[PDB]
Structure 1
Amino acid sequence: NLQNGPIYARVIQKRVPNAYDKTALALEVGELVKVTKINVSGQWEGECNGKRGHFPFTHVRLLDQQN
């Protein structure tokens, strides 16, 4: 499934989206986000806390549900 795919990256920083940004993804420190396409510029775009757009992965943590 996509909604609850394998990718499990949580957030630790709360960053507000720009006013002039429609496809912007909001980030709330301490939340579950599952992007769709990881960029090489540190920007992951996809699914974030049930939202769609682009967010600075430089303010989030990624995990593979494996401890």
Structure 2
Amino acid sequence: GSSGSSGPLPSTQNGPVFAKAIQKRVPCAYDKTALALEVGDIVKVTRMNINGQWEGEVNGRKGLFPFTHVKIFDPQNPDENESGPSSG
């Protein structure tokens, strides 16, 4: 079953998934890949692995974080948000 190169993912365009850290996640003393997050942080992930762990960057730190720690929501909603110049 000679295995060779087939080709990278298809030229597509999808939007990133935003998730807020509802819990405090800190990387073990021997965990560099583990991303550290705090209660009330936005983890911008672009590469989501089916396995479970995703690749997101937060505060200049990209690491793998558990999905059972963050909650998927719509942080891009005008709800509960006043609109005005130099106001908020």
> TM-score scaled by structure 2?
0.56
Runs of 4+ in 1 over 6 A off after TM superposition: none
Offset at residue 8 of structure 1 (A):
2.2
Query: RMSD value over aligned CA atoms?
Result: 2.3
Unaligned runs of 5+ in 1: none
> TM-score scaled by structure 1?
0.69
| Aligned partner of residue 68 in structure 2, secondary structure | helix
Tell me whether 1:59 sits opposite 2:69 in the alignment.
yes
Offset at residue 48 of structure 1 (A):
2.8
Q: Distance in 1 between matches of 2:73 and 2:59?
A: 15
More strand by share: 1
More helix by share: 1
Match of 2:21 in 1: 11
Larger Rg: 2
Match of 2:37 in 1: 27
Q: Percent identity?
A: 68
Higher RCO (C-alpha 8 Å, min separation 6): 1
Unaligned runs of 5+ in 2: 1-14, 80-88
